[PDB]
Structure 1
């Protein structure tokens, strides 16, 4: 029973950690999209200035 409840608590905490990693990934992806917008604008500006 003791090893059972140990494994159970560990799996719950691991699920929480995976959710936190998902949050980190979402934040970084938002930042990357924000950068990509400016990159596309610079691309259009270069096409104009060419």
Structure 2
């Protein structure tokens, strides 16, 4: 039973590592989208002037 438990826990640890990886990828993409929206806000602030 202990062998089963330790093998399962190790594999679950690797799975959690993969989860951290996918979270990192999504966060990087979102950070870039944030930069793009920031530049769009620059352009809006400039264009609002008459």
**TM-score bracket for the superposition, by shorter chain length:** over 0.9
When the two structures are aligned, how many residues end up with a matched partner?
48
- TM-score w.r.t. structure 2 length? 0.94
Q: How far apart in 2 are the matches of 1:21 and 1:46?
A: 37
How large is the RMSD of aligned CA atoms in angstroms? 0.4
CA drift at 1:28: 0.3
**Alpha-carbon distance, 1:13 to partner:** 0.3
Flag structure 2 segments of 5+ consecutive residues without an equivalent.
none
Pairing partner for 1:43 from 38, 41, 47: 41
Question: Where does structure 1 differ by over 4 angstroms across 4 or more consecutive aligned residues?
Answer: none
Q: Which runs of 5+ in 1 are unaligned?
A: none
Please, what TM-score do these two structures have when normalized by structure 1? 0.94
